[model samples]
Target: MKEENVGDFTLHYGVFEEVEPEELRNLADMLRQRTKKDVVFIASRKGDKINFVIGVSKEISDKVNAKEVIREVGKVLKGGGGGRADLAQGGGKAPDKFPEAVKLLKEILSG
Candidate 1:
């Protein structure tokens, strides 16, 4: 995971290739459990779709949920999904949106 420092928190993220859902879940879980960072976004791109698992720490979950964040980011992918606050997952069919999704992640952290 790559770590970035935000205003008062840190974010860890990764853009991976073709990871299984269960495996992705475990990876997100491990990140959420181990990091004191503000958030985490683990994404996998396969074929024409890009799926992601987001984990937001308690420090910020009160302000926003991972699900909502993903929902907004999903627009870039042309897809949608939902999950809990501490951990959530979703994806979209637009392969080209990966770059835009990366930009959105930063926008989300800053916002």
Candidate 2:
């Protein structure tokens, strides 16, 4: 996982090849539980589709919402999704834009 410090909050993210959405959620949840930090996990298959999961720690949900994060990031991937402030998942067709989506998430969290 890649770790970033945005102000007082820490963000954890990782990209996987051919991983299931459930596995992505599990990974994000585990990381959030252990580190008490926000996490975003993404998986891609055959450079075609992407699946992503976002987990926001309870302590920072007021400042960073998983649903909002996924919504914005998904836009970059040409997709859309929403869920609770603490956890969210989404799918996209532009696997090549995953890196750009991650960059956008970082910018969102930085604010």
Candidate 3:
């Protein structure tokens, strides 16, 4: 998985094709467990739409809430979704805005 450091926390992420949203969620959870860090997994089908799952490590939930992060990030893709503080899922039709969404996520985490 690709990764970035945000202050004291780590953000693991990936863009995949031909994967189920559930699989992405599981992958994010596994990454969070193995690395003990936050994770976000994005899946695109045929370069049309995009789906994503985010998992926040328990230790960093106070600083980084998956639900809140997804709520903001999803907008860049013209989508919306919500979940618990530690985990969330969402999608959008603007696959082309994925990089911007990721950048927004980084900016949010940096704060």
Candidate 4:
């Protein structure tokens, strides 16, 4: 649900709240159906910002438009951020936007 950054990049570590088992299952499905490879969804919170770190293995990330997909998702949440294909990450300034991100992911999977 959120991430806590202990310190600067020097102590760079993030923690994500657990997603519901069913949602996790669907997220895994999305990873395979959309990205064509299993990716780890890591969401963190700092102050009021919600961050999403999508773990895309180097092997499969390039095959898909990670930016396009992630941008689409971020757009749904009314926020924006980007990262490398292998490790896509983002920060949504609004904590309220977090659940929308999850919903966006599900919608992407459904579509």
> What tens digits encode model 4's per-residue C-alpha lDDT throughout 8-103?
101112235544434443443344344334444545555665655554434556543446556765665556757666555555666566567655
- Per-residue alpha-carbon lDDT of candidate 1 for residues 1-111, written as tens digits (9 for 90 to 100): 588886565777787888976788788777766655667777888988788878877667866588788888777778887988778888788867766876787877778
Which ranges in model 4 have alpha carbons more than 4 Å from their true place? 1-36, 62-64
> Which window of 10 residues has the lowest lDDT sum in candidate 3?
37-46
Any idea what lDDT model 4 has? 0.48
TM-score, prediction 4? 0.54
- Candidate 3: C-alpha lDDT: 0.76
Worst 10 residues of 4 by lDDT: 5-14
TM-score for candidate 3: 0.89
Alpha carbon deviation, residue 82, candidate 1 (Å): 0.3
Model 3 clash number: 0
| Higher-ranked by TM-score: 1 or 3 | 3
Worst 10 residues of 1 by lDDT: 30-39
TM-score of each: 0.86, 0.89, 0.89, 0.54
- Regions of candidate 1 where Cα sits further than 4 Å from its true position: none
lDDT (0-100) at residue 43 of candidate 2?
48
As a TM-score, model 2 comes out at 0.89
